[PDB]
Amino acid sequence: SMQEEDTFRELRIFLRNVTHRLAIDKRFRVFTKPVDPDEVPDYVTVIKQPMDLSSVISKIDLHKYLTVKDYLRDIDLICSNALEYNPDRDPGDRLIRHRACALRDTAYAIIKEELDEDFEQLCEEIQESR
């Protein structure tokens, strides 16, 4: 219905706004673009499902997210990929892991404060009806 299309459009506006606020944070720069195969050749072979904030924006615009739950699965993937690729005790790895957890924590905190629970429930019920 038109009301349901309006609901998903509001969802996309909300998700673009959250994603933009993450992408402009200097801490999260490393998560804003896919990994360069030239600088890091073994990334594509180690990380089977790469994810980054530019790809998240692309997926929003392709209508790939029908709920905030599905969006947070990709935020979680950005973070979990970073922890898996940088597991060592060296400061370079520890810095990226700290930033990855901060990205995840920040996304969840924005959503906890700004996502209306009844709006998410409506999205989920439309999704389940398709």
Ligand SMILES: CC(=O)c1csc(NC(=O)C2C[NH2+]C2)n1
């Ligand atoms: C996106 C992501 O997780 C990523 C990009 S580079 C990297 N890790 C390194 O470059 C290692 C050298 N210090 C750690 N991780």
